[PDB]
Enzyme design. Structure first.
Site, PDB file in Angstrom:
ATOM      1  N   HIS A 121      51.313  36.098  45.712  1.00 50.98           N
ATOM      2  CA  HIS A 121      50.294  35.269  46.325  1.00 50.98           C
ATOM      3  C   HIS A 121      50.613  33.818  45.976  1.00 50.98           C
ATOM      4  CE1 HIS A 121      46.616  33.089  46.630  1.00 50.98           C
ATOM      5  NE2 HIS A 121      46.246  34.000  47.512  1.00 50.98           N
TER       6      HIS A 121
ATOM      7  N   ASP B 226      49.076  30.978  45.341  1.00 48.94           N
ATOM      8  CA  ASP B 226      48.408  30.363  44.199  1.00 48.94           C
ATOM      9  C   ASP B 226      48.918  30.975  42.898  1.00 48.94           C
ATOM     10  OD1 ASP B 226      46.728  28.673  45.736  1.00 48.94           O
ATOM     11  OD2 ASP B 226      45.132  30.209  45.790  1.00 48.94           O
ATOM     12  N   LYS B 227      49.075  32.300  42.884  1.00 51.87           N
ATOM     13  CA  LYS B 227      49.580  32.971  41.703  1.00 51.87           C
ATOM     14  C   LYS B 227      51.033  32.611  41.412  1.00 51.87           C
ATOM     15  CE  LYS B 227      46.399  34.625  39.244  1.00 51.87           C
ATOM     16  NZ  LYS B 227      46.868  33.710  38.196  1.00 51.87           N
TER      17      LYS B 227
ATOM     18  N   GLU C   8      51.145  21.188  36.685  1.00 45.67           N
ATOM     19  CA  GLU C   8      50.668  21.760  37.927  1.00 45.67           C
ATOM     20  C   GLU C   8      51.859  22.123  38.798  1.00 45.67           C
ATOM     21  OE1 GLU C   8      47.746  22.239  37.483  1.00 45.67           O
ATOM     22  OE2 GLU C   8      46.706  20.422  36.775  1.00 45.67           O
TER      23      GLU C   8
ATOM     24  N   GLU D 284      52.000  16.228  33.438  1.00 51.82           N
ATOM     25  CA  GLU D 284      52.288  15.452  32.240  1.00 51.82           C
ATOM     26  C   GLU D 284      52.817  16.371  31.164  1.00 51.82           C
ATOM     27  OE1 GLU D 284      48.787  15.692  33.261  1.00 51.82           O
ATOM     28  OE2 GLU D 284      49.336  14.335  34.930  1.00 51.82           O
TER      29      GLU D 284
ATOM     30  N   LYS E 279      46.622  40.670  48.432  1.00 48.39           N
ATOM     31  CA  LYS E 279      45.266  40.469  47.958  1.00 48.39           C
ATOM     32  C   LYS E 279      44.523  41.786  48.042  1.00 48.39           C
ATOM     33  CE  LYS E 279      43.165  36.554  48.763  1.00 48.39           C
ATOM     34  NZ  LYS E 279      42.495  35.452  49.512  1.00 48.39           N
TER      35      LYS E 279
ATOM     36  N   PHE F 198      50.699  40.682  58.962  1.00 48.57           N
ATOM     37  CA  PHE F 198      50.883  39.828  57.782  1.00 48.57           C
ATOM     38  C   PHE F 198      52.377  39.819  57.486  1.00 48.57           C
ATOM     39  CE2 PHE F 198      48.892  39.442  53.198  1.00 48.57           C
ATOM     40  CZ  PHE F 198      49.559  38.268  52.946  1.00 48.57           C
TER      41      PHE F 198
ATOM     42  N   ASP G 238      50.529  30.038  53.498  1.00 45.64           N
ATOM     43  CA  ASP G 238      49.355  29.463  52.861  1.00 45.64           C
ATOM     44  C   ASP G 238      49.824  28.699  51.644  1.00 45.64           C
ATOM     45  OD1 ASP G 238      46.486  29.259  52.326  1.00 45.64           O
ATOM     46  OD2 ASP G 238      46.766  30.794  50.800  1.00 45.64           O
ATOM     47  N   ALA G 239      49.443  27.437  51.536  1.00 49.77           N
ATOM     48  CA  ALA G 239      49.838  26.644  50.391  1.00 49.77           C
ATOM     49  C   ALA G 239      49.270  27.250  49.106  1.00 49.77           C
ATOM     50  CB  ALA G 239      49.321  25.224  50.530  1.00 49.77           C
TER      51      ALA G 239
ATOM     52  N   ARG H  66      43.876  27.829  41.201  1.00 50.65           N
ATOM     53  CA  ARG H  66      43.060  28.154  42.363  1.00 50.65           C
ATOM     54  C   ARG H  66      42.681  29.624  42.394  1.00 50.65           C
ATOM     55  NH1 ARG H  66      42.736  24.262  46.719  1.00 50.65           N
ATOM     56  NH2 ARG H  66      42.224  26.116  47.931  1.00 50.65           N
ATOM     57  N   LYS H  67      42.912  30.341  41.304  1.00 46.52           N
ATOM     58  CA  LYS H  67      42.539  31.742  41.164  1.00 46.52           C
ATOM     59  C   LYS H  67      41.824  31.953  39.844  1.00 46.52           C
ATOM     60  CE  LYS H  67      43.376  33.344  45.123  1.00 46.52           C
ATOM     61  NZ  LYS H  67      43.027  31.960  45.517  1.00 46.52           N
TER      62      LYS H  67
ATOM     63  N   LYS I 205      49.119  24.794  30.669  1.00 48.13           N
ATOM     64  CA  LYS I 205      48.464  23.999  29.642  1.00 48.13           C
ATOM     65  C   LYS I 205      48.726  24.572  28.261  1.00 48.13           C
ATOM     66  CE  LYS I 205      44.586  22.889  32.716  1.00 48.13           C
ATOM     67  NZ  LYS I 205      43.139  23.011  32.899  1.00 48.13           N
TER      68      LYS I 205
ATOM     69  N   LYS J 168      44.550  22.017  25.260  1.00 43.01           N
ATOM     70  CA  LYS J 168      43.667  22.028  26.416  1.00 43.01           C
ATOM     71  C   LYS J 168      42.706  23.193  26.240  1.00 43.01           C
ATOM     72  CE  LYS J 168      47.145  19.358  27.964  1.00 43.01           C
ATOM     73  NZ  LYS J 168      48.159  18.753  27.041  1.00 43.01           N
TER      74      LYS J 168
ATOM     75  N   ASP K 123      40.358  24.171  28.006  1.00 39.84           N
ATOM     76  CA  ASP K 123      40.147  25.010  29.183  1.00 39.84           C
ATOM     77  C   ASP K 123      40.755  26.382  28.978  1.00 39.84           C
ATOM     78  OD1 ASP K 123      38.729  23.316  30.942  1.00 39.84           O
ATOM     79  OD2 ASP K 123      40.612  22.544  31.819  1.00 39.84           O
TER      80      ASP K 123
HETATM   81  C1  LIG Z   1      41.853  14.819  29.726  1.00 36.22           C
HETATM   82  S1  LIG Z   1      42.676  14.987  31.327  1.00 36.22           S
HETATM   83  C2  LIG Z   1      43.475  16.611  31.181  1.00 36.22           C
HETATM   84  C3  LIG Z   1      44.628  16.612  30.166  1.00 36.22           C
HETATM   85  C4  LIG Z   1      45.871  15.845  30.632  1.00 36.22           C
HETATM   86  N1  LIG Z   1      46.462  16.485  31.831  1.00 36.22           N
HETATM   87  C5  LIG Z   1      46.931  15.725  29.537  1.00 36.22           C
HETATM   88  O1  LIG Z   1      48.093  15.508  29.899  1.00 36.22           O
HETATM   89  O2  LIG Z   1      46.575  15.866  28.361  1.00 36.22           O
HETATM   90  C6  LIG Z   1      41.347  15.472  32.409  1.00 36.22           C
HETATM   91  C7  LIG Z   1      40.493  14.313  32.861  1.00 36.22           C
HETATM   92  O3  LIG Z   1      39.992  13.590  31.725  1.00 36.22           O
HETATM   93  C8  LIG Z   1      39.840  12.231  32.043  1.00 36.22           C
HETATM   94  N2  LIG Z   1      40.713  11.414  31.189  1.00 36.22           N
HETATM   95  C9  LIG Z   1      41.970  10.933  31.457  1.00 36.22           C
HETATM   96  N3  LIG Z   1      42.399  10.141  30.462  1.00 36.22           N
HETATM   97  C10 LIG Z   1      41.375  10.122  29.543  1.00 36.22           C
HETATM   98  C11 LIG Z   1      41.218   9.422  28.337  1.00 36.22           C
HETATM   99  N4  LIG Z   1      42.139   8.621  27.826  1.00 36.22           N
HETATM  100  N5  LIG Z   1      40.049   9.579  27.680  1.00 36.22           N
HETATM  101  C12 LIG Z   1      39.075  10.388  28.194  1.00 36.22           C
HETATM  102  N6  LIG Z   1      39.170  11.091  29.345  1.00 36.22           N
HETATM  103  C13 LIG Z   1      40.319  10.893  29.991  1.00 36.22           C
HETATM  104  C14 LIG Z   1      40.176  12.078  33.530  1.00 36.22           C
HETATM  105  O4  LIG Z   1      38.974  12.247  34.244  1.00 36.22           O
HETATM  106  C15 LIG Z   1      41.130  13.242  33.759  1.00 36.22           C
HETATM  107  O5  LIG Z   1      41.203  13.638  35.096  1.00 36.22           O
HETATM  108  C1  LIG Z   2      44.154  33.824  54.559  1.00 39.84           C
HETATM  109  S1  LIG Z   2      45.072  32.582  53.620  1.00 39.84           S
HETATM  110  C2  LIG Z   2      43.933  31.168  53.636  1.00 39.84           C
HETATM  111  C3  LIG Z   2      43.786  30.546  55.033  1.00 39.84           C
HETATM  112  C4  LIG Z   2      45.026  29.780  55.510  1.00 39.84           C
HETATM  113  N1  LIG Z   2      45.288  28.613  54.636  1.00 39.84           N
HETATM  114  C5  LIG Z   2      44.907  29.318  56.963  1.00 39.84           C
HETATM  115  O1  LIG Z   2      45.624  28.376  57.314  1.00 39.84           O
HETATM  116  O2  LIG Z   2      44.096  29.898  57.696  1.00 39.84           O
HETATM  117  C6  LIG Z   2      44.804  33.082  51.931  1.00 39.84           C
HETATM  118  C7  LIG Z   2      45.702  34.214  51.496  1.00 39.84           C
HETATM  119  O3  LIG Z   2      45.566  35.330  52.389  1.00 39.84           O
HETATM  120  C8  LIG Z   2      46.777  36.036  52.474  1.00 39.84           C
HETATM  121  N2  LIG Z   2      47.285  36.000  53.852  1.00 39.84           N
HETATM  122  C9  LIG Z   2      48.198  35.142  54.409  1.00 39.84           C
HETATM  123  N3  LIG Z   2      48.477  35.496  55.672  1.00 39.84           N
HETATM  124  C10 LIG Z   2      47.717  36.617  55.913  1.00 39.84           C
HETATM  125  C11 LIG Z   2      47.634  37.465  57.028  1.00 39.84           C
HETATM  126  N4  LIG Z   2      48.315  37.278  58.147  1.00 39.84           N
HETATM  127  N5  LIG Z   2      46.816  38.535  56.931  1.00 39.84           N
HETATM  128  C12 LIG Z   2      46.114  38.761  55.781  1.00 39.84           C
HETATM  129  N6  LIG Z   2      46.147  37.978  54.678  1.00 39.84           N
HETATM  130  C13 LIG Z   2      46.986  36.948  54.788  1.00 39.84           C
HETATM  131  C14 LIG Z   2      47.745  35.383  51.482  1.00 39.84           C
HETATM  132  O4  LIG Z   2      47.590  36.052  50.253  1.00 39.84           O
HETATM  133  C15 LIG Z   2      47.214  33.959  51.414  1.00 39.84           C
HETATM  134  O5  LIG Z   2      47.583  33.290  50.244  1.00 39.84           O
HETATM  135 CL   LIG Z   3      43.757  32.668  48.709  1.00 44.95          CL
END
Ligand SMILES: C[S@@+](CC[C@H](N)C(=O)[O-])C[C@H]1O[C@@H](n2cnc3c(N)ncnc32)[C@H](O)[C@@H]1O
Ligand SMILES: C[S@@+](CC[C@H](N)C(=O)[O-])C[C@H]1O[C@@H](n2cnc3c(N)ncnc32)[C@H](O)[C@@H]1O
Ligand SMILES: [Cl-]
Ligand SMILES: Cn1cc2cc(-n3cc4cnc(NCC(F)(F)F)nc4c(-c4ccc(Cl)cc4)c3=O)ccc2n1
Ligand SMILES: Cn1cc2cc(-n3cc4cnc(NCC(F)(F)F)nc4c(-c4ccc(Cl)cc4)c3=O)ccc2n1
Ligand SMILES: [Cl-]
EC number: 2.5.1.6
Lengths: 384, 384
Positions: A18, A20-21, A46, A59, A170, A239, A247-248, A253-254, A274, A278, A280
């Site tokens: 998938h 996203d995965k 990311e 980063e 899925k 499919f 699909d991007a 996103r999961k 991460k 982090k 999270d």
């Molecule tokens: C803390 S960052 C996530 C961690 C980051 N990707 C890293 O490289 O450590 C998440 C969010 O915190 C906020 N953030 C960024 N720089 C920060 C800072 N110096 N102090 C506090 N919050 C900050 C921003 O809103 C950012 O999108």
């Molecule tokens: C349905 S797509 C999301 C919508 C899509 N971005 C669009 O442009 O309509 C989300 C997920 O569904 C699955 N998918 C992609 N094509 C599909 C298809 N033809 N039939 C069923 N599921 C599908 C894949 O796992 C994909 O990542």
């Molecule tokens: Cl999806």
């Protein structure tokens, strides 16, 4: 018909291919590659996937020397995207990199010149842990079954018995539950959805038959299936295009697939890409560990834990425990037990859960919880 | 001290210039631009942001002719990133586009040659709606306050009274609640976190004083604040680098901020960048509408609704209503009322909630729910 005292709940899962995965797995392959050389790497990677493209953005400050081309392509190879006929090929895709150092302002506020145990949370945020005694692994049956259906597809793809399968899939499972004094007891499977990418030659009837007989029946106990269970198998009808081409994908996103399938609660943070600073990820893992420890310790049958942080501050801002009516202890008593047994500073979680170890790619498909006896799945023996 | 029968809950929000929120807003600016010319545009636009870069990735099939450079740059301008000194500039950033048509396999399975009311769900998935009578707008106070703190920062930035502010911010609010027969009553604010990007000249004490006196006091009623409330204001100590330069942004990475702040439940789907055929958005909006209608209709004080779909199938696979003990009606009775009053096929939701209208950029900061009398916030009068 839904008897009083029973209810439906639905969860979904997705396969290793998938899109996203894919991104979660690549992000965690990158994290692991850094940690293999620098256990203290600061990683916030990311991944974005679309036709022909893996982009890394984020980063990283690390002493490691990482070959991103190799790491990305080997992760895609593992997933199974190895030919243009499948829509994506690790050998020939574009790998773009937009990676910078960690912001020095974050670094100075979080970890620079700080004792490890006293490192600040890497961000603010809220996180929840959940556990339920309805399965041995203390996870909701809805999500466990959904994951296992995807794993079965990958198994039958890889063993060649369903060679028309492709990596993107899925699944979705609705279970009817009986209420039981705050806990839940699965009764029956109400609806199953499976969609899986496939080759141009196999027909819909062959696929639907195989999905029922070789996938569902090989995963879901027959006692939960009856003549009224509803099956939506290849419900889109076709499919062939799939993976990032269909699909991007993006990392993170999961997040509900990664956790409890909608049960419990979620604070919004993504796990993959991460390092342990982090919260999270580390605090969510620790909160799962707390929840599972409370259930396996016989204090609860079902429990939710919320923690939260401020960037730069090590201790959680507060902790709360909700037992759904399944403990004889009060909420105050459970909190006291948790505070006496756990230290949820990230610089202590890292030690308890061994979070510098490069095991993260393994977490990034089929859920982070309920499998493989990761450290957060091994309950702590509670003293009180 | 936490009295028995009371508990803490935390939610967060982020500002318009938070990098993930930038991406949501751009994705929805793109959606709106398409819908202005083609109400039936099929849009699945992800946005990725890092230093100097907005990337659009995804799938759009539309009769519109959209100038992506202009749409992206005007959205960034609106947010306030207009100079290299702030870390990001709409005039001079890179805008890259990796957009393809919608997969024909999805199109054929979802909407090709289908009557609009009978269009299939654009994906499988699960979605929840939630409402709580603890505020007039039927939202959790934790999330409402967190959003309002970010809005106040943007207001004081834009009106020039705190000219050292920059667009990227995060806030977090912990409230203590009293249980009230399944409903909740806010008692006090326990902890507030605010982090906001700032210029190189202003000092920490000036910022912390302003955040307390001009932001918190201007947002949070004094009756909820006391000498024990904990404030974490600029807790990292320094936040000059911010926006995408500080932290990569992606669409759909603030899904809990977008919804209920951790209350209720979440099915995992992101809203921004998606047209109404994507049930991740339309069904979540409809489920909010149902929940709010049940509360404003006097049937519940607090309620959670789960719906789910299979790709290609118009009707939800099931619907469930949980009232937390706050209705005299049973779950069966509430479901009957919902089924008699609502039709949750996406091709009917679109009509009820006017989801071809280009209002989506307005939804993409400060939460999708609880504000501005969007259609899903106007309760339906229930017949039963
Ligand atoms: C803390 S960052 C996530 C961690 C980051 N990707 C890293 O490289 O450590 C998440 C969010 O915190 C906020 N953030 C960024 N720089 C920060 C800072 N110096 N102090 C506090 N919050 C900050 C921003 O809103 C950012 O999108
Ligand atoms: C349905 S797509 C999301 C919508 C899509 N971005 C669009 O442009 O309509 C989300 C997920 O569904 C699955 N998918 C992609 N094509 C599909 C298809 N033809 N039939 C069923 N599921 C599908 C894949 O796992 C994909 O990542
Ligand atoms: Cl999806
Ligand atoms: C004595 N007792 C009473 C009980 C009530 C119990 N219960 C009954 C439920 C009935 N319907 C639904 N429907 C799904 C919805 F629409 F809400 F999303 N959810 C329920 C949930 C529940 C609520 C939120 C979340 Cl996240 C997960 C599950 C629940 O916990 C369970 C055991 C009990 N024991
Ligand atoms: C008679 N009555 C009993 C009640 C119990 C009520 N209650 C008491 C709670 C106590 N602690 C916590 N702690 C936070 C946690 F750690 F769990 F995340 N959550 C609670 C929740 C709650 C559970 C899941 C989610 Cl998503 C949101 C809120 C709750 O609903 C509320 C009203 C009541 N009235
Ligand atoms: Cl963030």
């Amino acid at each position: 018909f839904i008897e009083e005292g029973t209810f439906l709940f639905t969860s979904e899962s997705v396969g290793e291919g998938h899109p996203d995965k894919i991104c979660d797995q690549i992000s965690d392959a990158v994290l692991d590659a850094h940690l293999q050389q620098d256990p203290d790497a600061k990683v916030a990677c990311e991944t974005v996937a679309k036709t022909g493209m893996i982009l890394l953005a984020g980063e990283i400050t690390s002493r490691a020397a990482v070959d991103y081309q190799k790491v990305v392509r080997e992760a895609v190879k593992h997933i199974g995207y190895d030919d243009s006929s499948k829509g994506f090929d690790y050998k020939t895709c574009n790998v773009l990199v937009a990676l910078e150092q960690q912001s020095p302002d974050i670094a100075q506020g979080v970890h620079l010149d700080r004792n490890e145990e006293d490192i600040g949370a890497g961000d603010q945020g809220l996180m929840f842990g959940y556990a339920t005694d309805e399965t041995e692994e203390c996870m909701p049956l809805t999500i466990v079954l959904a994951h296992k259906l995807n794993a079965k597809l990958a198994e039958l793809r890889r063993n060649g018995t369903l060679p028309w399968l492709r990596p993107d899939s899925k699944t979705q499972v609705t279970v009817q539950y009986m209420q039981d004094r705050g806990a839940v007891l699965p009764i029956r499977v109400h609806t199953i959805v499976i969609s899986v990418q496939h080759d141009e030659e196999v027909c819909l009837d062959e696929m639907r038959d195989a999905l029922k007989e070789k996938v569902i029946k090989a995963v879901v106990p027959a006692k939960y299936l009856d003549e009224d269970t509803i099956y939506h198998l290849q419900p889109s009808g076709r499919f062939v295009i799939g993976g990032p081409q269909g699909d991007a994908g993006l990392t993170g996103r999961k997040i509900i697939v990664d956790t409890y399938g909608g049960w419990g609660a979620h604070g919004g943070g993504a796990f993959s890409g991460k390092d342990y600073t982090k919260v999270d990820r580390s605090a969510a893992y620790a909160a799962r560990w707390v929840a599972k420890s409370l259930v396996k310790g016989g204090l609860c049958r079902r429990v939710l834990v919320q923690v939260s942080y401020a960037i730069g501050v090590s201790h959680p801002l507060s902790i709360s425990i909700f037992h759904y009516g399944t403990s004889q202890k009060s909420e105050r008593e459970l909190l006291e037990i948790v505070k006496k047994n756990f230290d949820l500073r990230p610089g202590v979680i890292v030690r308890d859960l061994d979070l510098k170890k490069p095991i993260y790619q393994r977490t990034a498909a089929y859920g982070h919880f309920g499998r493989d006896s990761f450290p957060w799945e091994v309950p702590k023996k509670l003293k009180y």
